[PDB]
Amino acid sequence: MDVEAFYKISYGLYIVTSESNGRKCGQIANTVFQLTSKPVQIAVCLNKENDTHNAVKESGAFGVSVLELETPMEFIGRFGFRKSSEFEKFDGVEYKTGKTGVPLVTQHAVAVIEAKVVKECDVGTHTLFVGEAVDAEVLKDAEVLTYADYHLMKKGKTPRT
Amino acid sequence: MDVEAFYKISYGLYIVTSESNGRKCGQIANTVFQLTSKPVQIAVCLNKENDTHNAVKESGAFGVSVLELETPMEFIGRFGFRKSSEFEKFDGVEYKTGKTGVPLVTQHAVAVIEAKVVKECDVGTHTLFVGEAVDAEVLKDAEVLTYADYHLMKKGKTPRTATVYFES
Ligand SMILES: NC(=O)c1ccc[n+]([C@@H]2O[C@H](COP(=O)([O-])OP(=O)(O)OC[C@H]3O[C@@H](n4cnc5c(N)ncnc54)[C@H](OP(=O)(O)O)[C@@H]3O)[C@@H](O)[C@H]2O)c1
Ligand SMILES: Cc1cc2nc3c(=O)[nH]c(=O)nc-3n(C[C@H](O)[C@H](O)[C@H](O)COP(=O)(O)O)c2cc1C
């Protein structure tokens, strides 16, 4: 089995957020997808080792920020290469509080979505949370960043509108 | 709540296949994603009213063909009918059969993945099938077709994969 075949699967790039016990958590995730339309349900798959996973497990709510094409790599690293409980990821970033109580990061976001968890599907190393959308807003007219784009950025390439 | 925000989520375009009661089934789908790496697990979300949904639930296996950017619309159309015979879907289509028994469509595919269902997550109108990948292969050196590209091209417009430029 050639693991490189899985590189061919397409994804967006997002920040998945939640808050539990006054602790704001956020992580980068590429595994975010809409599952149904009646009602609108969005799934996020988070590693059980993540602080954001535990915040979602406890609070039963999560936010999703869809990242824009021009999101800086340091912003991606702020959320994707350290733990929320060990580094204040939200200090220095613009965000607001959703109707569910989750922090919705507006900085570099084309849109934000907040959802309440209605089902958890354990898949081993990760938990697939199924959330029913409670609110969603489009914030910018910018192009979205894809996971494939991010891999081109990793190679030193930079987006040019 | 602005529904347009949900259209900002990215997806690929795939043919999800299965075989049940000696009949090959296939359906276009955009909701296919890798859940885990240890072991590799792939999720596919299918509407309960689709024949492929039932084929996967019965057989416990599925295949995924990742479509190339240049896939003709007529080919995609073969796998998008609510009701169509096996011959209507597969006649003249290049495919091979994996150890799980599912037909792996290789035509217009950049890669194919074969999986055995290990868990089902019922989400109401759809079932999210969690499959443990048993095989996977890269077949071509071509760009993938994203769901957004598909929608653009369908309307005779240039793909995003062509409107965005990366500077080395
Ligand atoms: N939990 C999840 O669903 C999930 C999904 C993705 C990543 N992650 C985690 O996120 C962090 C950063 O991951 P990452 O995305 O930077 O990579 P990574 O998963 O750590 O991949 C390591 C290397 O594999 C190659 N590679 C992997 N995926 C590729 C792709 N889609 N396209 C092209 N090359 C690919 C590249 O090799 P070369 O650079 O040598 O070409 C890349 O540097 C890591 O801690 C990783 O474990 C978690
Ligand atoms: C490009 C990229 C994509 C990622 N995708 C996911 C994902 O889909 N699911 C996941 O659980 N972690 C994913 N991660 C890893 C988390 O963002 C990372 O482990 C983060 O440090 C977790 O933070 P937390 O402990 O504060 O939740 C990704 C990281 C990067 C850089």
Side-chain angles (χ1 to χ4, degrees), chain B residues 14 28 62 70 103 115 119 130 144 157 160:
Chain B
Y14 318 82
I28 294 302
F62 65 86
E70 291 300 297
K119 183 189 186 83
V130 183
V144 303
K157 293 188 173 181
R160 198 227 72 163

Side-chain angles (χ1 to χ4, degrees), chain A residues 44-46 48 53 57 120-123 125-129:
Chain A
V44 296
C45 196
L46 315 178
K48 291 176 183 180
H53 163 101
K57 194 80 171 169
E120 292 174 356
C121 170
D122 194 308
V123 296
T125 53
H126 292 60
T127 298
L128 180 75
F129 297 93

Side-chain angles (χ1 to χ4, degrees), chain A residues 11-14 16 24-32 44-54 76-85 89 126 147 150-151, chain B residues 34-35:
Chain A
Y11 306 76
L13 200 64
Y14 316 84
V16 174
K24 294 184 291 293
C25 293
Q27 60 160 278
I28 292 292
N30 65 348
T31 315
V32 178
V44 296
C45 196
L46 315 178
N47 190 304
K48 291 176 183 180
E49 291 186 35
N50 298 171
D51 284 335
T52 305
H53 163 101
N54 298 329
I76 291 170
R78 166 186 285 271
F79 288 94
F81 291 107
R82 64 208 76 209
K83 295 183 173 288
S84 296
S85 65
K89 293 177 174 179
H126 292 60
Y147 183 55
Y150 159 81
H151 267 286
Chain B
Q34 180 176 0
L35 303 136

Side-chain angles (χ1 to χ4, degrees), chain B residues 24-58:
Chain B
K24 296 182 298 292
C25 215
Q27 167 74 53
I28 294 302
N30 69 344
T31 305
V32 173
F33 56 92
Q34 180 176 0
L35 303 136
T36 63
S37 56
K38 305 192 198 70
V40 175
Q41 289 178 300
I42 304 295
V44 300
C45 196
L46 301 172
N47 188 305
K48 285 178 183 185
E49 289 170 354
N50 292 357
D51 288 340
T52 297
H53 164 98
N54 303 328
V56 172
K57 194 171 181 63
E58 290 168 48

Side-chain angles (χ1 to χ4, degrees), chain B residues 125-160:
Chain B
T125 51
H126 296 235
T127 296
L128 187 70
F129 295 94
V130 183
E132 191 178 304
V134 292
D135 203 3
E137 161 176 28
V138 174
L139 307 166
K140 304 166 57 63
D141 180 7
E143 298 297 298
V144 303
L145 175 64
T146 64
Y147 178 63
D149 283 337
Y150 171 72
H151 261 58
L152 267 40
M153 296 184 90
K154 183 181 179 180
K155 298 187 294 293
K157 293 188 173 181
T158 61
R160 198 227 72 163

Side-chain angles (χ1 to χ4, degrees), chain B residues 9-25:
Chain B
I9 294 175
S10 295
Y11 307 78
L13 199 68
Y14 318 82
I15 304 177
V16 172
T17 55
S18 197
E19 204 255 40
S20 192
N21 300 147
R23 187 161 313 179
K24 296 182 298 292
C25 215

Side-chain angles (χ1 to χ4, degrees), chain A residues 12-17 28-29 64-79 89-96 104-113 137-146 153 159, chain B residues 8:
Chain A
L13 200 64
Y14 316 84
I15 299 169
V16 174
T17 56
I28 292 292
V64 172
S65 298
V66 180
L67 297 173
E68 71 177 320
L69 175 65
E70 310 180 318
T71 299
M73 186 65 47
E74 63 176 24
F75 189 79
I76 291 170
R78 166 186 285 271
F79 288 94
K89 293 177 174 179
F90 296 78
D91 180 23
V93 175
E94 300 163 349
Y95 65 96
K96 58 182 182 176
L104 293 169
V105 178
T106 54
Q107 196 174 323
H108 298 303
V110 172
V112 286
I113 298 159
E137 173 177 20
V138 174
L139 308 175
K140 307 184 187 302
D141 196 62
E143 293 300 297
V144 303
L145 176 66
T146 66
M153 291 167 69
Chain B
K8 298 300 185 185

